[PDB]
Chains A and B, each alone.
Chain A
Amino acid sequence: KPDPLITKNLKPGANYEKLVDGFVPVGTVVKKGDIIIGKVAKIYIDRSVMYGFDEPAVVDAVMRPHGPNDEIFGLMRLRYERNLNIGDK
Chain B
Amino acid sequence: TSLEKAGLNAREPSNVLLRMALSSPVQVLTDAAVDSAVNPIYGIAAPTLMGSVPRIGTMYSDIIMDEKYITENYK
Any A–B CB pair closer than 8 Å: no
